Write an enzyme that holds these catalytic residues in place. Sequence first.
Site, PDB file in Angstrom:
ATOM      1  N   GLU A 357       0.821  -1.208   0.000  1.00 52.25           N
ATOM      2  CA  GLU A 357       0.000   0.000   0.000  1.00 52.25           C
ATOM      3  C   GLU A 357       0.857   1.260   0.000  1.00 52.25           C
ATOM      4  O   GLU A 357       0.527   2.244  -0.673  1.00 52.25           O
ATOM      5  CB  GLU A 357      -0.942  -0.002   1.206  1.00 52.25           C
ATOM      6  N   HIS A 487     -12.282 -12.448 -13.569  1.00 58.52           N
ATOM      7  CA  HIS A 487     -11.848 -11.291 -14.342  1.00 58.52           C
ATOM      8  C   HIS A 487     -12.559 -11.212 -15.688  1.00 58.52           C
ATOM      9  O   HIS A 487     -12.918 -10.120 -16.142  1.00 58.52           O
ATOM     10  CB  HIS A 487     -10.334 -11.340 -14.524  1.00 58.52           C
TER      11      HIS A 487
END
Length: 594
Positions: A357, A487
């Site tokens: 992150e 996906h």
Amino acid sequence: STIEEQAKTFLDKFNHEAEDLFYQSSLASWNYNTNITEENVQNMNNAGDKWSAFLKEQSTLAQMYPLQEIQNLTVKLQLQALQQNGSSVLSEDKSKRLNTILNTMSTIYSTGKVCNPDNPQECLLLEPGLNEIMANSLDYNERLWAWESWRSEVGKQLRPLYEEYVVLKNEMARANHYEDYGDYWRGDYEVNGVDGYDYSRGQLIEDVEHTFEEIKPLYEHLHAYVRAKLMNAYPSYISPIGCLPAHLLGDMWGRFWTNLYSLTVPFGQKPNIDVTDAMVDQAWDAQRIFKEAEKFFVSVGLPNMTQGFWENSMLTDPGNVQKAVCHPTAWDLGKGDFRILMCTKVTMDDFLTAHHEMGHIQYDMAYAAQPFLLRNGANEGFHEAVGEIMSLSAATPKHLKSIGLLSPDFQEDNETEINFLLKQALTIVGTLPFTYMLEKWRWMVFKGEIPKDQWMKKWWEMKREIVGVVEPVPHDETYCDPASLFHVSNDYSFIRYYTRTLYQFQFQEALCQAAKHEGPLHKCDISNSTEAGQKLFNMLRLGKSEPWTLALENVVGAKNMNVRPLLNYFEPLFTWLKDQNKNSFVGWSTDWSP
């Protein structure tokens, strides 16, 4: 008063107003993710609708501007991203048909159920409980039957809507001066109009094929080792000339094999590195995790940033006082405002995700000086790749010993490093050929070249011959199991993951050869080395303002891509496999049939 100055002021006012709308929408989405309310839903829904209308209006007003009358590369690129077609030739009925097809194939697959036998009450959903009995299970029959039950009620309902989506997206690509949906997808992977650095959309196909045939023998050797281990794990289930079962790869599709590790342990006598209990006896927390990440980043060379961000991000468990998700996510809200969101626990993977992150948000604030249209990476896969290399590079035990996460009494041996490289191959290079064949099948599907009705065994047969995985049970024409994945169901490409793997490998090789490091490539350290930090920062500030080939050139020095990072990183593991399991049968044979 030429057209360039009008384009400049139009671009500036679009950047400002879109920045305001994006800031409002991202702020509302962030505080809704922390505090779930319906009023917040209405807030960012109205904001997003107004921003979509605004972007449509800006595109239509920019259609006046001649794209051939701009000599500056930045203004030409921003007008090109502003003069996109999108819905230039699109009937409203065709548009709503496309939207309903997208929503239906998302909702049917997302709400799938495996509730065939017994009473119709005990239904296990796909996310929480299905993967437990497909991955962490022992029964071959249960895995086979559960996978068949999952495919049966999904493929028949998912096939014709997906085919109509393929047809309509092909028609839209043709109407938008492109070849096919993949050609529209290859437009970002295209460097044309740039002198010296010239790349074609088919050059990406050539690169995919070249990398696959470069990684074929090592993947064959690891497949041989996995089958040799499965001979002892599964007595008399897989023939030596046969391929691996579909449901034996942990996941239903065969995405990650990290779940298939307890059966594939190389040595039980070699302990891997673990600072989680060392964290417990050190009693570190979320702010301490973030401070360690910042200490690592300033050891690399990236400077510190805003002190109001840390209080603005809630890191521990939100609790039941307000509904909030626990997926670790970043928030680049816009003009000098970023947030992170997770519930921090004492796990080593929490440290990995925190480093991921912070890499994401560092790359976010790097291109803040670039405009809002250029406030992204060079392409989509670059951001995930640069998050992943900061994620993986934090798992170096010398850094943990320097910062005190690992005690100096522990030592690193050759066999432990070999096991770590084997786990890395199970995570990184294990998913690479699966991503390859998914990308190839999707490209033949979206190109509209292969017949729709030739898929009796086609995806089955090059699953058998390309990666060495054989299905346990045949399926009919109505099945669309490679199109049944997460996906493809929401139209999320797979070229992004391949390019992410390539970019992260090349970047890892460049930083290991640049930050004064010599020796094994999986023992790579970047602390106390600011030359790699400034070499990174030279490309961090570039953003979307430049072609991706230029971005790779300014940080590597080369103009192309080679698999030599993969060989350099996996050379000790490749040698250990070559003197370990070369005696067994290597590769796969497609002659085995069910």
